[PDB]
Amino acid sequence: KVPPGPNITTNYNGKWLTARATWYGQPNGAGAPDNGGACGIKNVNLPPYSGMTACGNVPIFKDGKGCGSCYEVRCKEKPECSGNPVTVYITDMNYEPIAPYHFDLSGKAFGSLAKPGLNDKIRHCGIMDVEFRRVRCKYPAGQKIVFHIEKGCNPNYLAVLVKYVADDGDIVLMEIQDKLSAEWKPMKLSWGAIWRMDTAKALKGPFSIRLTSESGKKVIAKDVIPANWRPDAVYTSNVQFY
């Protein structure tokens, strides 16, 4: 049995750590056959993620609190290795105790670690020792944080997904407050980047949401939730982590 890392914090100490990488799914896909993952963010194949997805064990993944993080991995062991790093997003998980730190890259990502034209070649080594370090996350400019409403059930129990969180990348607490009776009530971490609000009878009127990065940093989106909100509906805010 192989014991996990630790466990990576928001301590951005720009230096490389060892880890074993492998890939899963299609060779030119974004990992999950459905292009989604343990985090609950979907379309990880399309931009911005654009298939540069990956999986990590407890240390990296952190039971869903690492969802959003960005890491930089590079290969310099076996040939055909670009030598240069690729910026990966953590949108899924894999807890197999095969090594202290483990990354399970997409075919796209795993390939990107290779010198131009050697992709598919390098993808057939399956497992190799890579090097990495977490990094703040950068998205296209102007790209703010987006909240997606999930498929409901019992009369309004909500559940919001949060994507495109720059810098820390990952969330560790969400909370609300409707029009009147402010005080920011927490939220349940249903799973991954999905947060749940059991009660919803009282909570009425454009809601404000406060996110707290792994670091403690916080932000506030006033509306982003009218009232005529319907599951699947998507809201974009004017707030982000710098």
Ligand X SMILES: *[C@@H]1O[C@H](CO)[C@@H](O[C@@H]2O[C@H](CO)[C@@H](O[C@H]3O[C@H](CO[C@H]4O[C@H](CO)[C@@H](O)[C@H](O)[C@@H]4O)[C@@H](O)[C@H](O[C@H]4O[C@H](CO)[C@@H](O)[C@H](O)[C@@H]4O)[C@@H]3O[C@H]3OC[C@@H](O)[C@H](O)[C@H]3O)[C@H](O)[C@H]2NC(C)=O)[C@H](O[C@H]2O[C@@H](C)[C@@H](O)[C@@H](O)[C@@H]2O)[C@H]1NC(C)=O
CA distance 141 to 188: 31
Stated as kind and residue range, the H or E segment containing 196 is: strand 194-196
Choose, by CB under 6 A, the member of 9, 12, 63, 233 that binds ligand X.
63
Choose, by CB under 6 A, the member of 58, 67, 158, 166 that binds ligand X.
58
Cis-peptide into 48, omega within 30 deg = yes
Q: How far is the CB of 34 from ligand X (least distance, A)?
A: 22
* x/- letters, 99..138, toward ligand X (CB under 6 A): ----------------------------------------
Q: How far is the CB of 9 from ligand X (least distance, A)?
A: 9
Closer Cβ to ligand X, 16 or 191, answer by number? 191
By the rule CB under 6 A, 62 interacts with ligand X: yes
Contact call for residues 126 and 78 (beta carbons, < 8 A): no
Q: The tokens of 139 are what?
A: 């998205």
CA distance 70 to 63: 16
Closer Cβ to ligand X, 7 or 43, answer by number? 7
The span of 13-21, 38-46, 58-66, 118-126 binding ligand X (CB under 6 A) equals 58-66
Q: How far is the CB of 189 from ligand X (least distance, A)?
A: 5
Which residue's C-beta sits nearest to ligand X?
Answer: 7
CB atoms within 10 A of CB 12: 13
By the rule CB under 6 A, 159 interacts with ligand X: no
CA distance 210 to 213: 10
Q: How far is the CB of 240 from ligand X (least distance, A)?
A: 25
- Total residues belonging to the chain: 242
By the rule CB under 6 A, 7 interacts with ligand X: yes
Q: Looking up tokens 């009369």, which residue turns up?
A: 155
β pairing state of 53-56 and 194-196:
unpaired
The CB-based long-range contact list for 222-229 (8 Å cut-off, 24+ gap) reads 224/147, 225/147, 229/149
The span of 32-40, 56-64, 165-173, 230-238 binding ligand X (CB under 6 A) equals 56-64
Q: How far is the CB of 168 from ligand X (least distance, A)?
A: 15
Choose, by CB under 6 A, the member of 17, 125, 189, 219 that binds ligand X.
189
Q: The tokens of 41 are what?
A: 């963010």
The span of 55-63, 70-78, 126-134, 207-215 binding ligand X (CB under 6 A) equals 55-63
Q: Count CA atoms closer than 13 A to 201's CA, side-chain side.
A: 2
Residues lying near ligand X in the complex (CB under 6 A)? 6-7, 58, 62-63, 189
